[PDB]
Symmetry: D2
Subunit: 97 residues, 4 copies
């Protein structure tokens, strides 16, 4: 287990401004993995194994691409080896929990 | 009032992995403006006038830079003309409210 | 005083109908050329060098120009600023041996 | 089975003294070990090649830099389309 905190956004192009079903489809993929999932208005934060996050990201990106012609997906990872890599700690450290 | 939804992250390249202090300074800066501020584990989501968000972004970036030698800040704007640009609608649209 | 130099990268994603957005990407780039900035376009975004306020204004105009033709646009601006060294594309690339 | 995509990556180490060029250079050397076209710019590195290879390269680059510091924030952005080839060349030509 190599825990990290990440943020992902899967954006489909060519379908117009209303793409909520695609964003929802991606979130469903993340939930299939052993990850804590916190969705916000601009993306989804994930907490879990680095490899699992990488697999989930690829699957989320691919599942949306299956229904559209083009997708721009972003993955940001924040990992430190001196403290626990969790969403709770991160939030508590800045008074957002 | 040209409302948009955005996500920002201000990362200082000074001290080690310890930078929660700077993250908090930025959040407080945003809250001085007439913006809805929703912070998550990987950044802060903002809702409000575009010009106000740009101003806030610059100040937040600057306030953190005042204490360190280098800062890498990110601003992502999501704006549409067919529906209201609110955090509430975005979350409701994907069933995450 | 009239120059607070930084290096930045901008990418604009239009969410419209049809497969291809190069037309809008091109439009945004043309906007950058109206400001006193060094412009280095790559396959995933555009790198800019110049005054922070000018980059912010250029960013807003680029985003707005594309939004003029589509219903929704997701635009990204990343700023890299340091006070211990010069903020230029040149120094960044030479430092990397590129 | 090739699945070509274009991506951009930035590996940013936290806590070492504003100057992190040696770490950025290290990440770049890692990308070069993969069969990917590598085009570095002042704010990141653009990659072209197989998706899995890019994901692996991203992981290894992030990990290599993390080996020398306490914290690293790495970003990966993928742009993939099914209606046209996924090359840096085409993307650049399409926009002049």
């Amino acid at each position: 287990m190599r825990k990290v905190v990440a943020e992902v956004s899967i954006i489909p192009l060519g379908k117009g401004a209303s793409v909520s079903k695609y964003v929802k489809k991606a979130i469903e993929v993340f939930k299939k993995y052993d990850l804590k999932v916190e969705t916000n208005a601009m993306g989804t934060v994930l907490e879990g194994d680095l490899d699992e996050i990488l697999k989930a990201f690829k699957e989320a990106h691919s599942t949306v691409l299956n229904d559209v012609d083009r997708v721009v997906s972003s993955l940001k990872i924040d990992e430190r080896k001196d403290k626990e890599n969790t969403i709770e700690r991160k939030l508590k450290a800045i008074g957002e929990l």
